[PDB]
Design an enzyme around this catalytic site. Sequence first.
Site, mmCIF file in Angstrom:
data_model
loop_
_atom_site.group_PDB
_atom_site.id
_atom_site.type_symbol
_atom_site.label_atom_id
_atom_site.label_comp_id
_atom_site.label_asym_id
_atom_site.label_seq_id
_atom_site.Cartn_x
_atom_site.Cartn_y
_atom_site.Cartn_z
ATOM 1 N N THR A 67 31.987 -63.997 -49.145
ATOM 2 C CA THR A 67 33.383 -63.982 -48.742
ATOM 3 C C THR A 67 33.653 -64.933 -47.588
ATOM 4 O O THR A 67 34.788 -65.002 -47.106
ATOM 5 C CB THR A 67 33.798 -62.567 -48.352
ATOM 6 O OG1 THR A 67 33.231 -62.249 -47.079
ATOM 7 C CG2 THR A 67 33.299 -61.564 -49.378
ATOM 8 N N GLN A 121 36.184 -54.088 -40.004
ATOM 9 C CA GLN A 121 37.098 -53.795 -41.104
ATOM 10 C C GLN A 121 36.379 -53.044 -42.219
ATOM 11 O O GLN A 121 36.906 -52.063 -42.769
ATOM 12 C CB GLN A 121 37.711 -55.098 -41.620
ATOM 13 C CG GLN A 121 38.813 -54.934 -42.653
ATOM 14 C CD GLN A 121 38.357 -55.150 -44.081
ATOM 15 O OE1 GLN A 121 37.216 -54.869 -44.431
ATOM 16 N NE2 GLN A 121 39.254 -55.664 -44.915
ATOM 17 N N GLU A 159 40.757 -56.384 -35.148
ATOM 18 C CA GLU A 159 42.069 -56.661 -35.703
ATOM 19 C C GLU A 159 42.833 -55.355 -35.860
ATOM 20 O O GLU A 159 42.303 -54.395 -36.431
ATOM 21 C CB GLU A 159 41.987 -57.364 -37.064
ATOM 22 C CG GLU A 159 40.849 -56.899 -37.953
ATOM 23 C CD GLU A 159 39.584 -57.712 -37.763
ATOM 24 O OE1 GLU A 159 39.027 -57.697 -36.647
ATOM 25 O OE2 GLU A 159 39.147 -58.363 -38.734
ATOM 26 N N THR A 200 33.211 -59.341 -35.931
ATOM 27 C CA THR A 200 33.285 -58.042 -35.271
ATOM 28 C C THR A 200 32.112 -57.162 -35.672
ATOM 29 O O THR A 200 31.368 -56.673 -34.813
ATOM 30 C CB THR A 200 34.604 -57.350 -35.607
ATOM 31 O OG1 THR A 200 35.696 -58.108 -35.075
ATOM 32 C CG2 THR A 200 34.629 -55.953 -35.031
ATOM 33 N N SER A 234 28.883 -54.478 -40.989
ATOM 34 C CA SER A 234 28.507 -55.562 -41.881
ATOM 35 C C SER A 234 27.959 -56.721 -41.065
ATOM 36 O O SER A 234 28.417 -56.991 -39.953
ATOM 37 C CB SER A 234 29.696 -56.044 -42.710
ATOM 38 O OG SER A 234 30.725 -56.528 -41.866
ATOM 39 N N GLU A 273 13.213 -35.911 -40.041
ATOM 40 C CA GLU A 273 12.274 -35.724 -41.151
ATOM 41 C C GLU A 273 12.074 -37.035 -41.908
ATOM 42 O O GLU A 273 10.944 -37.525 -42.055
ATOM 43 C CB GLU A 273 12.800 -34.650 -42.129
ATOM 44 C CG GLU A 273 12.894 -33.122 -41.790
ATOM 45 C CD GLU A 273 11.585 -32.377 -41.562
ATOM 46 O OE1 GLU A 273 10.897 -32.589 -40.563
ATOM 47 O OE2 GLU A 273 11.240 -31.546 -42.413
ATOM 48 N N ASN A 287 27.281 -56.334 -52.075
ATOM 49 C CA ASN A 287 28.368 -55.989 -52.983
ATOM 50 C C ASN A 287 28.057 -56.384 -54.420
ATOM 51 O O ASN A 287 28.594 -55.784 -55.358
ATOM 52 C CB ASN A 287 29.654 -56.670 -52.518
ATOM 53 C CG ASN A 287 30.236 -56.027 -51.280
ATOM 54 O OD1 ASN A 287 29.523 -55.763 -50.316
ATOM 55 N ND2 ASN A 287 31.547 -55.834 -51.271
#
Lengths: 87, 427, 52, 432
Positions: free
Chosen positions: D171, D11, D63, D137, D132, D246, D198
């Site tokens: 989260t 997601q 999802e 997932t 993430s 590089e 975050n």
Amino acid sequence: TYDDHYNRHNYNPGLPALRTWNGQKLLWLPEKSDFPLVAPPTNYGLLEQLQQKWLASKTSLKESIYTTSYPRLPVCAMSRREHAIPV
Amino acid sequence: MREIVHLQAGQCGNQIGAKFWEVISDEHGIDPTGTYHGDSDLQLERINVYYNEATGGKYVPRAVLVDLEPGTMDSVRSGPFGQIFRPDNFVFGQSGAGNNWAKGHYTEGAELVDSVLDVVRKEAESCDCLQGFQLTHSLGGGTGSGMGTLLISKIREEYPDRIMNTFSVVPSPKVSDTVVEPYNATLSVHQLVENTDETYCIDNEALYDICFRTLKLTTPTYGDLNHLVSATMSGVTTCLRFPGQLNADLRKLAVNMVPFPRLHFFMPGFAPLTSRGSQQYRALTVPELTQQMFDAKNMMAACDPRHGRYLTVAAVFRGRMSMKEVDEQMLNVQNKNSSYFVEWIPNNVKTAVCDIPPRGLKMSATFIGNSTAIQELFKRISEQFTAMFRRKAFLHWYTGEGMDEMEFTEAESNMNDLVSEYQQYQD
Amino acid sequence: GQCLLYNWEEERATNQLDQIPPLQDGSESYFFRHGHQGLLTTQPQSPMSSST
Amino acid sequence: MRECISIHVGQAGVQIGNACWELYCLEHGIQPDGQMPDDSFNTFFSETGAGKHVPRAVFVDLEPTVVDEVRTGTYRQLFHPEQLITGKEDAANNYARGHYTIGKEIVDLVLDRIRKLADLCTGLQGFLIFHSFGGGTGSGFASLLMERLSVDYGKKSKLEFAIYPAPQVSTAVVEPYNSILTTHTTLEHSDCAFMVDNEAIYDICRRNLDIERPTYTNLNRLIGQIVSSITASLRFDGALNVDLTEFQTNLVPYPRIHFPLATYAPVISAEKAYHEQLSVAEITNACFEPANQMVKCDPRHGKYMACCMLYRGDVVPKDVNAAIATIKTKRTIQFVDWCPTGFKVGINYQPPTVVPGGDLAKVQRAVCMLSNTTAIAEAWARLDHKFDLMYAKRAFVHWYVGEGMEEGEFSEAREDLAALEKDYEEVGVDSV
Ligand SMILES: Nc1nc2c(ncn2[C@@H]2O[C@H](COP(=O)(O)OP(=O)(O)OP(=O)(O)O)[C@@H](O)[C@H]2O)c(=O)[nH]1
Ligand SMILES: Nc1nc2c(ncn2[C@@H]2O[C@H](COP(=O)(O)OP(=O)(O)O)[C@@H](O)[C@H]2O)c(=O)[nH]1
Ligand SMILES: [Mg+2]
């Protein structure tokens, strides 16, 4: 939210273009993080698509599948036959 | 007759190489189309030293442009003098080297060098009497330090007699733009020493010092730096192109300048550097050149010659002058700075004069110098090399390519042996 | 460089010699990426001397 | 011609893809329907017969909802309908679901699509993968796809942009497990990683951009800016064009050390920008301040190993040089004994564009930093502390064993990252 940002390009006519001060609320008073636009909601053709998908059910549609499958074709859609042998 | 082949590799060599072809196209008076629009006869008599004849009064550069990435080839084609270069002279790879000396020299350069060797052999067979090869590249890249230094190994075996010089770009210790920089250079210096007749070590730092102080431009970009390198490139070969009171060539200085084939590293300088604001207020004589060219601030490399002894000096003059104080000022600088010369080579200054001036300037001069101070720059790489090598850092990139570990040791052993015997020639 | 500061001498000396962006370019670095024209060949409109 | 393939999974991957592809379409000038009404543009957008360009990305999510949102958004006519792949059920914060039973149904479809994309492209520069660590997932599918991608393409570089779980805010609750166990894939089947949290970008947006209440899109635009700053050297011209290879070579000293640090400058609003004069010295001084990291760690408690600087716009090599010299003349910034030179400078000419309704002001020049440094060792030190504090009581383990993975790999993963931080201590040791 995705429609608000990516689809609408943050199109909020009521929101001012720039930011200024506020005195007591020691901030910059306009803020796009709140006060969304609450215009006509996220919509597209799916309403009418479903409306047609269920409206085209209750019809007296007796006919052979042959006659409903093979109609009279337009004369515009005939092949032009570009590449052919004689002069 | 006396032809010159310009090898062109890497982002470095491609940019100054295009810059170099811009300067000498102006002087010989070719438009970017390819026609001769100069005026004098002497502009077009010996054009065939760099230029190859074409039908319809066209002239094509006799240069071979290579890069392992195709992005620069669109750029040089998109330059001011972009259409002048032959499409077959563009040989290019799909994958860049990654500042990896190993990748450009053995992995992917191996498949491409035959294409570069193909065009050069046809380039060699086109000229009747080739005087030698010329290459511009970066000792701190992956292509020029890598595949380019591989090309040197092949053509020298193929053409032993011809003289090849490298207008290479050395890294600076004060400023660098690559973490793995001492690895390629230490793996590059080990190759130039074996087969190269003389090397003009160019420093990118001292050029920024020049434009800040000597020329006082507020925003000299890389193009201005390439011009001063391009100025030196034309300055060395001018006596070959034109008549002179006493002429010279690439052999007349290369024979005159190296007492030993190991000592072949040079420090190139340009004389008439004056700011744009006060050009009309400048006086133009022999003395102020000699005071200008022997100053260390004028120098384009990152070594102070006051810390070393001058072994040999070659200076090529451009401009119709006579020799008397040209000869006298060389004596004045010799006896006064007697400590800054070595004593076993008497009259260590070499002079050469060509008759023609450049465009827009009645006079020019180019200085080519062998000094002890060039050995200081090499020790600065080893101090950087050993510190990274002792921890074996950044090494699996080289290790995973089939390379062994001892090639890092032998290259360290070589240049240490070089500065060892170089130091004993100071004392 | 109308203000007199930080090499305003040279800035006012070549105030117009360098500033010719024809209103499409928005960056002097992009305009002069190739190299500055007025360098070491001031008034570059003199041909070769035919005198040998 | 150079081409990069985007591998957006999860997601978060889909959302970052939305932002980044919006920015790419804008900066190339592409219409959202897919028509063009110097730059290269071939590296990302691929021609079709009807004069229409199709992005080179794969969006995968287990999802269907978030992908269907793009399927019904403005850009519905821009992405190839085969390019976006969905699954009926998600992994639901479970590595075992994301890796052992759910992924295997669609692994082959994803690989076939990637094979077709690679056959369309001629010169592939590499694989940029967005995911993430927290999501089931985003961890599991990325892990299995990466381990199969490694054997499919041995020499192609595989770059990772990953959302690390934040030091404090979370989260979810079961994320230390997934972040711990995705480390084997990201350690042996990777080339470089771009971990971000975050929380740090929340602070940076509150502090400089003055938006007091940022939402996810405010982060996604910044991430898109990061990736455009990264790939500008492939996209356009410049004095010093830099490449993925590089900076992999100039940023990875050892095979177990491939986690640089992301940093962007200048990140300010219009009211700031109109009165603050932006110089190369100021932007490079801001990019080194510890209050400007995208990850919660102080470099003052670590030691820098290598840095890639990417300048862009009306940037001049001399003021870059003065900036670097001034940076080096500082006792506060430290470097290891074995890296006397530790900067790689890349230069691009095209100034960064602005997304309408955005937050960053219109700036002539920009810089990006990728800093491989040892101060990120504390982040996994905290991760190890919390992982042991939960695993000591065998919490949530039954979900994993029921989905069908074995339990020795738990201790194996803990030992793995303990070895990682041991090696980082080894490098931090100085030979003085
Ligand atoms: N920066 C940023 N992070 C995001 C975004 N969306 C999700 N994340 C991160 O993703 C993590 C959760 O993973 P998800 O993407 O929601 O779920 P998943 O990866 O698909 O795995 P499953 O839940 O099993 O389907 C959260 O901890 C967030 O930090 C986003 O738009 N921007
Ligand atoms: N003086 C000068 N140096 C340049 C120019 N272009 C590139 N360089 C230098 O070349 C180095 C990078 O070379 P690189 O592209 O890696 O060479 P390659 O890998 O062999 O193709 C940088 O350190 C620059 O300082 C130029 O036009 N002039
Ligand atoms: Mg999910």
